[PDB]
Design a protein around this ligand. Structure first.
Ligand SMILES: Nc1ncnc2c1ncn2[C@@H]1O[C@H](COP(=O)(O)OP(=O)(O)OP(=O)(O)O)[C@@H](O)[C@H]1O
Ligand SMILES: Nc1ncnc2c1ncn2[C@@H]1O[C@H](COP(=O)(O)OP(=O)(O)OP(=O)(O)O)[C@@H](O)[C@H]1O
Ligand SMILES: Nc1ncnc2c1ncn2[C@@H]1O[C@H](COP(=O)(O)OP(=O)(O)O)[C@@H](O)[C@H]1O
Ligand SMILES: Nc1ncnc2c1ncn2[C@@H]1O[C@H](COP(=O)(O)OP(=O)(O)O)[C@@H](O)[C@H]1O
Ligand SMILES: [Mg+2]
Lengths: 527, 529
């Protein structure tokens, strides 16, 4: 509660420490409280060293004594905002290097900084230097990259921008299932008709040609045998062998670079992930608030240049009412905010005619943005408006204490699941006699939760499904909820998913052994 | 000559020694005595081991050591699974050059080598263990007839390769064809020290490596590192150190200002060692860092006893010569803290190989898939000098459900056998399991397979509850006194996990109602034996 960003002088802190704890015993790992300038800090002992012999006359120890001439070095803890200044600051840490200064605004990508720097430092750091020094070191340039994330977050754009930054030929393109074509002799011919240019250029120009990027797509269809390890399905894998033989082995090339992009990172065989093969692995996620601001600020630059944007259409405000908006849907919103603005200045009488009197003053205004945000772009990983619109039918009316009790308990739970750090997951089970209104009192709590992501898994959309289809649908719905900082999920009629019928019972044991497992699974991290 | 430190292969001195002493001693002696005795030449070898340990390098080096043509190459799933009527043609073509040379000059030619990558697929009718085998006997029969059927040749040498040595039919191993078989293994400390000394040899020659870098110490921090990943570590370090000199603008150009002084420092090695290059037979701080989530607190006696017993079992399995295998079973009432203690016990063994086979990563799998996954997890532990494995929540692998009852009979029988199996000579293991229904496993006869069991109790006195509350440090002295005025004169029954949830639920009320709600909650869920 007392954290502050003000600088603290380590030299004074060390002096006060000596002035206080002189002639006192300290041991490695000891925890104590130190007061400096009427401020309390937590101190943890890390290293202890004995003094040198006196002038008249650096071993490591676990316990020792403090004296007036002892020296103290202060280092901030992990993820510590404490500001320390002075020469009493020992610098033993790990930070890699200072990556070359970048200007993302010109390139046209916003929100991706760490991923870009890491990819450049790893894959491409050795294709810029002259061949002389690279040969002297001795190296084998990386020939593989893997990317995976939700659709429409800016994956292909990264590859194209990085390729165009390094002077190189136009990248090719291939589709995953498209290479699975009926019979052999065409798919193998397709594989052959990918590296002919690269090999010919290598032979013609030796080891001095240019890079030949080859962007795949849905690499989890081909080179996919884990899909057979399921309740159904099954297919022999044959195309992965050809690509594996070409990428690594005899007649290997030195001017190739594959880039695989997928959507299900766990449906990949271990064959295509080992050093020498596709090496690095990065993940792209949904943008955050600053990401949305940067994205919007880049797509509305041309209009600002020619004075087509009104003065009252602030861009900052629009970054707080769009929650869990994918990357491409912001472009969609910007595009849809212009048709409405420019659809006013058009008059048709036996033929559409461009207006002349009011042709000037063609300025996009806040009204267009607001109308587009409410009835144009429909988000995907965002709050719905139809699911919890037909469930609660005739409102909620008080008839005693139980309604108040249920609503208060729901509110308490939904606030705990948002202001806690030791229990990321909490689940509550409503129950009562049949025909009592226990499905219109959960949708109300969900709608009052105010969480950005709100889904409803109901048996109404699984009519006639077998057990495997139900398992797959439930797994997908639950998986989709791990991609947001907050999530609320509803399950209706648990008795119906299991198919209970008391002439028996005849429950399904393949859904009850997944529903139990799912309800105990902490989200990846901090969600 | 056997200068096996200049060719490029390191850490394998005895393997090549035996391979040469037995197989290739006839092809090095002068031909006079070789013909006089009439000794025949070996025409088959089988190398098997873990993937990514240096099997192809040895093949090419043995090929070059005896002056011969450029080795050919083949693949397993490629020759098979092509259009019918053409696989036989490919197999016949494979030996066309050797057959032509033999017909041309008879018994005087150069060795024609082949490298039959991934041989345990096409020449394998032993595919029916849990799924089914494939009808491909034509390939294996043709290969056997060609190598040695009713005809013979003297200008061939077949070297196989495979990572699964127990899926080969004996028909391909009878003496006379594919006789010598050898096993490559993960290098030890000396092997790693030698390996790291070759891959970084050009750099030191050109005074482009700083003097601080230490190889001796670097050889002790990479444990159970495969051979092929030291190369990755070195390459990552080189890339990291050389990225500082690429400062550029919109168009990237080399920073020629200080192209010189390009030195690699120990810091880059350490950085690449901690953040990147994640080992294969070495485990990370990811698996055993999501189960433990709020540390461990000493709320009484049981914690100390359980931890002490765990330490005793570990030190037994590390310093014994007659009990290479040890097992222990943890049990207790639900919501008592069983999983959070197995990880803590295993994390302090400093064991090179650690893995956790939990049921939350297998959702919707069928019986056979689950059996095969468990078998693979177990098989990936016999290859390390000493290991440790965890099997948590057993009763959700068998799929027990009280109605019926309904178990899976194909998983229990694998689990028992794997629990009672002993590893190869010289290695050690330790298996830990956790369950919440002790009265069910006893019926199945499983409990007699586990070496020992421990009991994890719950909070059973007011003093322990007060101590836990104090250690968690949430309530003030006045509220603690108010609580003690009630809890002390009674008994309690609540697991440790439920206490956190109750406290979290209670804390969300107003400042003056943080005690009454907690006390009310403890009467319904808690204090209810
Ligand atoms: N506590 C309540 N107070 C007032 N009206 C309510 C209350 N609960 C539900 N309702 C209204 O009664 C109807 C509830 O129908 P609903 O489909 O929820 O029935 P149910 O008994 O919960 O269903 P099911 O039998 O499938 O569990 C809706 O019109 C809802 O508006
Ligand atoms: N001394 C302790 N012993 C055990 N758990 C403790 C202790 N102190 C704190 N905990 C917390 O107790 C929880 C125990 O883990 P968990 O809730 O998964 O229990 P479990 O027995 O594995 O559960 P389940 O029976 O549902 O499988 C962990 O969050 C751990 O942080
Ligand atoms: N981070 C981003 N910055 C700027 N534009 C983006 C970003 N992510 C996506 N876009 C926009 O989305 C459009 C299409 O994206 P696309 O590459 O198809 O996404 P995906 O990689 O999911 O296919 C592009 O025209 C691009 O302008
Ligand atoms: N023992 C070793 N010593 C030096 N380099 C090795 C060793 N093992 C593997 N490598 C390196 O790994 C690369 C590929 O190894 P490879 O022989 O393909 O592994 P595998 O035998 O599993 O296929 C080789 O180029 C080689 O430089
Ligand atoms: Mg209903």
């Amino acid at each position: 509660k007392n954290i502050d960003s003000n600088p603290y002088d380590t030299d004074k802190m060390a002096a006060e420490f000596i002035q206080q704890f002189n002639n006192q015993a300290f041991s490695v790992g000891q925890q104590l409280v130190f007061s400096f300038n009427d401020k309390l800090f937590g101190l943890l002992v890390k290293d202890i060293e004995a003094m040198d012999p006196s002038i008249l006359k650096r071993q490591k120890i676990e316990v020792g004594l403090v004296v007036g001439n002892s020296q103290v070095a202060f280092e901030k803890a992990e993820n510590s905002s404490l500001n320390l200044i002075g020469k009493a600051k020992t610098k033993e840490n790990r930070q890699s290097i200072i990556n070359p200064d970048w200007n993302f605004e010109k390139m046209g990508i916003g929100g991706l900084d760490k991923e870009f720097s890491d990819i450049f430092r790893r894959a491409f750091a050795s294709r810029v230097f002259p061949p002389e020094i690279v040969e002297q070191m001795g190296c084998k340039h990386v020939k593989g990259i893997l990317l995976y994330g939700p659709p429409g977050c800016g994956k292909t754009l990264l590859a194209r921008q990085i390729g165009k930054m390094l002077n190189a030929r136009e990248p090719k393109v291939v589709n995953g299932p498209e290479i699975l074509n009926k019979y052999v002799g065409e798919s193998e011919a397709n594989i052959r008709k990918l590296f002919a240019d690269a090999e010919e250029e290598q032979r013609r120009l030796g080891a001095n040609s240019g890079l030949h990027i080859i962007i795949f797509d849905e690499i989890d269809a081909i080179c996919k045998q884990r899909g057979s390890m399921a309740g159904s399905t099954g297919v022999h894998d044959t195309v992965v062998n050809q690509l594996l033989s070409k990428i690594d082995g005899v007649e290997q090339l030195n001017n190739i670079l594959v880039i695989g992009m997928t959507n299900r990172p766990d449906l990949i065989d271990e064959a295509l992930l080992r050093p020498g093969r596709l090496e690095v692995k990065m993940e792209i996620g949904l943008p955050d608030e600053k990401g949305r601001l940067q994205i919007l600020h880049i797509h509305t630059a041309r209009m600002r240049g020619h004075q087509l944007l009104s003065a009252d259409v602030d861009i900052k405000e629009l970054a707080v009412e769009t929650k869990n908006f994918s990357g491409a849907e912001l472009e969609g919103l910007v595009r849809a905010a212009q048709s409405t603005a420019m659809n006013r200045h058009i008059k048709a009488s036996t033929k559409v005619e461009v207006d002349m009197e009011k042709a000037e003053s063609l300025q996009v205004t806040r009204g267009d943005f607001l109308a587009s945000l409410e009835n144009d772009i429909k988000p995907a990983f965002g709050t719905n408006q139809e699911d919890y619109a037909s469930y609660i039918m005739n409102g909620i009316i008080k008839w005693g204490d139980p309604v108040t009790r249920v609503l208060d308990d729901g509110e308490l739970l939904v606030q705990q699941t948002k202001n806690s750090d030791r229990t990321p997951l909490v689940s509550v089970l409503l129950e009562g006699p049949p025909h009592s209104g226990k499905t219109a009192l959960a949708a109300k709590i969900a709608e009052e939760s105010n969480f950005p992501f709100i889904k409803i898994c109901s048996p109404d959309k699984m009519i006639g499904f077998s057990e495997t289809a139900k398992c797959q649908a439930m797994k997908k719905i639950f998986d989709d909820a791990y991609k947001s900082q907050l999530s609320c999920v509803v399950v209706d009629d648990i008795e119906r998913l299991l198919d209970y019928v008391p002439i028996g019972p005849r429950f399904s044991n393949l859904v009850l052994q997944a529903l139990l497992v799912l309800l105990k699974k902490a989200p990846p991290q901090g969600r | 000559d056997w200068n096996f430190e200049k060719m490029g292969i390191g850490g394998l001195d005895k393997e090549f020694s035996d391979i040469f002493r037995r197989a290739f001693a006839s092809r090095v002696f002068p031909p006079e005595i070789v013909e006089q005795m009439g000794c025949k030449h070996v025409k088959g070898i089988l190398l098997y081991g873990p993937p990514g340990c240096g099997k192809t390098l040895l093949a090419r080096q043995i090929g070059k050591m005896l002056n011969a043509r450029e080795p050919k190459v083949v693949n397993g799933p490629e020759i098979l699974n092509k259009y019918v009527g053409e696989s036989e043609a490919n197999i016949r073509k494979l030996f066309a050059d050797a057959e032509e040379e033999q017909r041309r000059l008879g018994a005087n030619s150069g060795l024609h080598i082949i490298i039959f990558d991934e041989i345990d697929a096409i020449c394998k009718q032993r595919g029916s263990m849990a799924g089914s085998t494939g009808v491909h006997d034509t390939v294996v029969n043709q290969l056997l007839s060609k190598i040695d059927g009713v005809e013979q040749l003297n200008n061939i040498l077949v070297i196989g390769m495979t990572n699964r040595p127990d899926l080969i039919d004996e028909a391909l191993l009878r003496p006379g064809r594919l006789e010598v078989k050898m096993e490559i293994g993960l290098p030890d400390e000396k092997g790693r020290l030698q390996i790291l000394h070759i891959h970084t040899a050009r750099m030191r020659g050109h005074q482009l490596l700083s003097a601080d870098v230490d190889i001796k110490e670097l050889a002790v921090e990479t444990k159970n590192f495969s051979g092929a990943e030291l190369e990755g570590l070195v390459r990552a370090a080189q890339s990291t150190a050389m990225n500082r000199h690429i400062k550029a603008s919109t168009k990237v150009e080399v920073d020629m200002e200080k192209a010189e002084s390009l030195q690699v420092t120990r810091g880059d090695f350490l950085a690449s060692l901690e953040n990147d290059i994640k080992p294969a037979f070495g485990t990370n701080q990811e698996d055993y860092a999501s189960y433990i989530m709020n540390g461990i607190i000493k709320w009484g006696d049981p914690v100390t006893r359980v931890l002490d017993d765990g330490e005793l079992l570990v030190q037994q399995t590390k310093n014994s010569d007659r009990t290479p295998l040890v097992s222990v079973l943890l049990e207790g009432p639900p919501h008592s803290g069983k999983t959070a203690l197995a990880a803590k016990i295993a994390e302090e063994s400093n064991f090179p190989f650690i893995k956790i086979c939990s049921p939350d990563k297998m959702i919707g799998f069928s019986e056979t898939a689950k059996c095969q996954a468990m078998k693979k997890i177990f098989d990936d532990a016999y290859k390390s000098q000493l290991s440790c494995v965890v099997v948590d929540d057993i009763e959700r692998l068998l799929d027990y459900v009280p109605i019926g009852p309904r178990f899976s009979n194909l998983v229990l029988q694998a689990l028992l056998v794997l629990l009672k199996k002993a590893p190869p000579q010289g290695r050690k293991l330790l298996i830990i399991g956790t369950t919440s229904r002790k009265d069910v496993l006893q019926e199945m006869e499983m409990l007699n397979a586990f070496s020992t069991t421990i009991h994890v109790p719950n909070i059973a006195t007011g003093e322990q509850l007060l101590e836990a509350l104090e250690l968690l440090g949430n309530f003030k002295d006045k509220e603690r006194t108010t609580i003690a005025q009630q809890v002390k004169g009674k008994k309690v029954w609540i697991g440790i996990k439920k206490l956190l949830m109750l406290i979290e639920m209670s804390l969300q009320m107003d400042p003056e109602y943080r005690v009454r709600k907690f006390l009310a909650l403890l009467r319904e869920e808690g204090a209810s034996p």
